[model samples]
Target chain A: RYRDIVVRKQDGFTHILLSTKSSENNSLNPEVMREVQSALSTAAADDSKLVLLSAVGSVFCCGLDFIYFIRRLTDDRKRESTKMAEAIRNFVNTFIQFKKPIIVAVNGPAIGLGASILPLCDVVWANEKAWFQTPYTTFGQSPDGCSTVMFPKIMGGASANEMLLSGRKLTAQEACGKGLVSQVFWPGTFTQEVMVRIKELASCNPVVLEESKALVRCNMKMELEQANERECEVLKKIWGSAQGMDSMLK
Target chain B: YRDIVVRKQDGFTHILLSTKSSENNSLNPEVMREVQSALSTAAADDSKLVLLSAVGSVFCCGLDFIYFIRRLTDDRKRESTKMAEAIRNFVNTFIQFKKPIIVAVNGPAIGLGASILPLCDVVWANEKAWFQTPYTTFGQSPDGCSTVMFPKIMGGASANEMLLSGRKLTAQEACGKGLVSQVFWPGTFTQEVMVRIKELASCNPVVLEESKALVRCNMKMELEQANERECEVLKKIWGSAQGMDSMLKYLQRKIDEF
Candidate 1:
């Protein structure tokens, strides 16, 4: 039933892998975003205690698929931009409202929306080789996934600005130091480490996990929902402009 | 007769707690008023900052429920309003204080005592200190802007564990969660605090106040709103015999056990 992703249900956790076979570097398109979100939905309803999100290939996600989007936007700008904006808004909303714990295993690099949304998850484990960046200015775009609010909270304003505005790249170790990623595992044993931790978490009482996540996210829910709306609005507004499209096309 | 001692030092005013009427440094309305009075004076004084700590092992055990319980025996309505008003004013003293307030948690900080830490500028704790806010156990809601600050500082999950489930956190855990800025070993805790305090006092007063304003100004409105809402809730709960029944019962059980 799934084309762009892989959803594997294990003993106690749902492993949602962003395979993105049709896309390069596992970049997100509207369809890919929805498919992964659908997997999350299924996991939410199941007896699964938590979710393990990881990409199958070398790159975790390079963020928005500009190449594919350029083709789609080559036609009508308004419809394509509006549709993409809605998809991202809904996708981020799912993470903000998700009840169960989400443990992200970044086997490789994670960029843009990929890195921006890590704070929404309960825990993030990264490979030693994995790096993070969000070059928003290069693309003439603003932030998405509530990163505008979440980033400053996770990292101090100065460090967050260096990433969000200056588009500075951070190594896996630097990201962990800045609190974006909780732990860093070696590339050779990343999967094994992630599985061990995920299983241990799955062994926890489901109700406590769910309740804990709910409480942690409760105060920020309204703020995040509003942030997502504002971010998506900015995306649509910029993408609809000829200058924005031309700059991004560069 | 003084429940608290306010001594002015070089650049910082020290507010030391010495709860005479209650054990474990619990706060009565009178003690809160004295605290508020001291803070008001310091707000206008040459003191660039305030250092709030308590005597003995237990830093603070929140409200003196035993003292309050006697007052609430019959005229629960009048006493609750008065006490809630007193608490609102006392907490507001911290939230709106222009100068930075640094707290050293030397021991246990329970209920309002623990909640107040987040309102201060910096929280340095002794290794032996513990933090808790058993609001639900007391049949009360939160105060000291904890509903907002706790979730923001640490995540809501951990915050609720303290608020709802009455979880107790050691100094290290509280530091890990961001409630306490740093934890020092009990032996060197005072020395560490003094060294840091002297260093801070050495900075330019304008730079210090301006820095504090920059950090606190954005959230000031939201915190004030939270304080107001919490006090209203307190008034509603404390004013009602039915609402106060559970908290009084909780207090009495502990008292009888003691």
Candidate 2:
């Protein structure tokens, strides 16, 4: 039903595939982001036990569709910057406030906001072909997806800064060692392994799953909300500036 | 009154939780009171650190629900509030302790026992010990700031599995998941802990305190507020009629199974 994404429901979980009719590398434009948000919002109220996210081909998600974003910026600089930042803040908040578990399968490279948001998911399984990087500084942008807080919390400040500040890339094994990934599997058996755990996780009591997540996320709820706000404000400033516009445009 | 074993070393205080305290060293009001007192003394004295461990095979089995049940049966409303308040203060003591608290887990650390490990400065578990929260299964919410610390130590995925699914993590798994700093074989658990504790104690006390302060300062307010909010939620859960009924239902099932 969605133009930008594909949704399939099975035994106990809904699989949201990022086929990305909008762009290659599954880069998210505003339309693709809203489609995903809509898919997850539907799953939240349904009988589905959880949501599984992956991409159709190689390249899971390379993050924002800068090509599309630049066009919008040129049309109406101030208005587009404000709207784009709002879209990101809202998109990030959906993950933060999601009641059900969102498990991600990284089939290939996950870059920028894509990599930064892995910690938001309940579990992330990666294939050997997958790699991660969030080169926010490279584009003269600040961190997003609550990465500023979650990255430091999971990977510690030193490693998180390397990736956030320097755009260091990590292989599947290295990402697992840094706690960015729950587990990594070879491409040959990656889907089978992910499905095995997904089935087990889906079979759990629904109430137990939700309440447990509540307890785990309750303490940092306020912090994440504020972080989203702060990040978007920074985006508004940067994207509105001539340098920020020129950096991405080039 | 005498449930915990407190021994003051030259540079640190050794607080051993004996089985005599409660079954598998479960915590109750009295046990917590003793623990608080021990912490107060350590904070005031020349001890540079606290080495918390157990004398028995079981590290700690979390709350002594049976003991708390008795008080609840007498006066559910009053006791629940008081108990939550007591627990709030008990946990705050750990959050506010100026010196470092190191945990030596000898066996299973369940529920609040496992939840509290994140609040300590260092945790080393014996190979035999395991960890779990099981709060949802127990018809309870989290305490000891597990809601915050668990996600910080491990990621939300593993932390939620432990808290919600009652997933048992082995010593090695716990270490892998970032809960335990390291795991030692059971045969040399105590010896290994003492060796490390003495080495840590030999450091300059001022440096130790200042370093700990820096590490813990950022989260102090966050943790303190979590303790307060968790306790309040606990009060609401344990004080309500349905909440009390839920506990009784589990209590009855437990007896039948036993």
Candidate 3:
């Protein structure tokens, strides 16, 4: 059963809500990645013009599940590590290859992969309470989710360096101003406002929508795939190493 | 007389854009050739940075309308294709130029003039400077790689507004919108730009080049293809009699006003 993800369809729009109650925080693990991927595949096949991604908890997602991840690192689970890496990779690519427009509602704090994937969406709406950070360096792990390529392209090289290298957190206003998010709305009316825009986007001609999206992203596919391969290779080496594992564990 | 002037300073090359004929630095075939040659020469040399600015009150008034009308009346299709090719060459040269470029806008940069700013590494504009892309108003598609770079530099909605509505942005508005890196007061704009250029030139050449390469790596092919597509579209658009008449009249009115 889907414990952390909720998929609801309404008016040709499918909303994939991240509701990670059992995890205490919506930290992405192998299971969460698998279920999210499954939900995304299902939504892709459905008669949906738009996919609205939002979260239910205070933290949209807290990157990787350190508890499960550290355990996997210590245990004799080399195969599981590969699977975990591939799951995250597929999840990133699934959204990349999806034909429908994705509207992400950043309800709260998003860190690590959660923040890195914002550039993949067609339109991003952030609430006043929302913020984004990537602390990958602090954990001794290289970034996954094509953050290197996406960040430089979307946020410019200097700003991307500040976030990726310096562990800077961008406020909702900063994110919007920097072109990472399309718009920012008040926290209270975020849902109401996002839904209004989603409906308007859904009403657009589907062919034009698809074509326009394809045109803008025509060159990014190969770069992202290569970035994924490089990140996965480095991540596999570091995830269970003495320094990296100890850093995360501590 | 030469419309383009190339000057060399310490560790940097400065190319001054001006019109020998009038105040408006209208780009003609000769001026375009000079710009392309100047840029190539600067890039080939040991200069760490290139500074692009103009001498006249107006930075560039875009394509010479008289030339546009002349070409429209004589071998319109062939001439338009040649113009598009020239634009493609100029735009791609800027993109392919390996070293860092710092652009200083002294006054109004209109049409192709405005679009080229997005290609530079850093841009400093005078308080009197403004940017406008009026290709849509002239019944033509955008060229000079603006179609590709503008949306990426500025947000999509803002880029669309400028492309579709032919909206003009003042220097302050442009700086806020990510079109220009900074805006300086009129009198000191050139001095400040040179100071910054000297600083950039002082950095390690390998590091600067590597950083520039990394920033532009992913979108290189896309930008080049967009430039090609823009040329094709522009050729077709200007080949039409209505499109030609519209552009001719527009340029004529602009010339008359000036």
Candidate 4:
């Protein structure tokens, strides 16, 4: 049933791995997005206590599918643009509001929305090869995935402003140091170590886990929604505009 | 006048917490009131930035242990819970201050001093500086919004270690753990911070205010509420006679050693 996504269920947790048959990078196209949502729902409904997100190859998912972008832009640009934007927003909001504790294993470079979504995860572990870069401002679009809210609160205002304004690339160690990720593992042992950690977390008292996660996320939900709304407004103005199109095309 | 000094230069206001007493800049009610007044004065002015610093080695020793002892000995004694009110007023003033605050930690920041660091917009520390929250050690409940802001800035585990265990974090350690923004070489810390403050002051004031507002938009209500909660806990403990006896001895020992 899944083409670009893989799902594996364990006794204690579920693993959702991103992969792609048609592209070198696992960018989420519509089909892959559907599978992702389905996997999330399945994981949420399962008895497992944890949901782990990882990628199949060296690079983790590299943001949205550019191939689909080109096709959508070429045919019925206006209608397709709005629809695609809504789909992307919905996809992101799904992750943001996911009740289960989501753990992300960053195997390599995470760019654009890939980096934007990191803060939504309850725990993030990065491989030595992992890095994060956001190019939203460079593309003449505002940030998404509640970045405006999370980045400032987590990394401090100056650091967040510098990263967003400069499109800075943070290495795995730097990312971990700055609280972007919980920890970084050596490349060879990254997957094994993350799996063991996930199993350990999955063994935690389910009620306690849910209660603590809810408390931590109490003030975040409304702020994230507001930030997403502001971002969407700015994105709608810039996504298909002449300047945005020129920047993206270039 | 000897307890605190406020200076202005290039639209930037610097409030230096100083003490001539032998108590090592212990934060007494008088100092707290002056600090609150300094904040109000700075807020009323056109200052682009407010820099909080200290004159000597110790930044602040939380409460003035010596003053507390004096209050205990006085015939017409003031209630110990009054100190909690003073702390709440000073801390809430810092939280509600309109402009950005930059703290330059020249030395150890203890108790209330350590708790106040997380409320500032930015904190620069000397290499020799350290931070400690010893409130629990003195049989008093924690105050100064440390209960809320510390855990939010630093992780819960680290905050718990400090708040519950009364563990001290050195300047380098605090910087590594996200509690401090930057730590400079001991001798150069003040100079480096002043340079940065001058540069920040020269920026467009409107943009600075807007950016600070956006960054702190969600914090004000929550922080004030946290301070009120802290005050409530503090008053309960501080007003009790047993609480006063234990707190008094804890201070008496430190002062005797000094």
DockQ scores of the candidates = 0.03, 0.03, 0.07, 0.11
Fill in the DockQ of model 4: 0.11
lDDT of 3 by residue, B46-88 (tens): 8877888898788888877677667768887788878888888
The lowest-lDDT stretch of 10 consecutive residues in candidate 3 chain B is B249-258
Runs in model 4 deviating more than 4 A are A1-94, A98-116, A128-144, A147-171, A187-223, A227-250, B75-81, B154-161, B176-178, B187-204, B250-258
Off by over 4 Å in 2: A1-152, A155-250, B19-21, B249-258
Measured on C-alpha atoms, candidate 3 has an lDDT of 0.76
The best candidate by TM-score is: 4
Deviation from native of the Cα of residue B188 in model 2, angstroms: 2.6
Model 2 has how many clashing residue pairs? 0
Model 2 lDDT, residue A31, Cα: 89
lDDT of 1 at B84: 85
**Ten residues in sequence with the least summed lDDT for candidate 1 chain B:** B249-258
> How many collisions per candidate?
2, 0, 0, 0
Residue pairs with backbone overlap in model 4: none
Please give the distance, in angstroms, between residue A47's alpha carbon in candidate 4 and its true position after superposition.
16
A141: Cα error in model 4, Å? 11
What CAPRI-style quality would you assign to candidate 4? incorrect
Candidate 3 deviant stretches above 4 angstroms:
A1-148, A155-176, A180-250, B21-23, B255-258
Question: What are the C-alpha RMSDs, in order, of all predicted structures?
Answer: 11.4, 13.2, 8.8, 6.9
Determine which window of 10 residues in candidate 4 chain A has minimal summed lDDT. A157-166
Q: In terms of TM-score, which candidate is stronger, 2 or 4?
A: 4
**Per-residue lDDT tens digits of candidate 4, residues B121-194?**
77788999988887766786777888887777677898888888888888888876667776789878768887
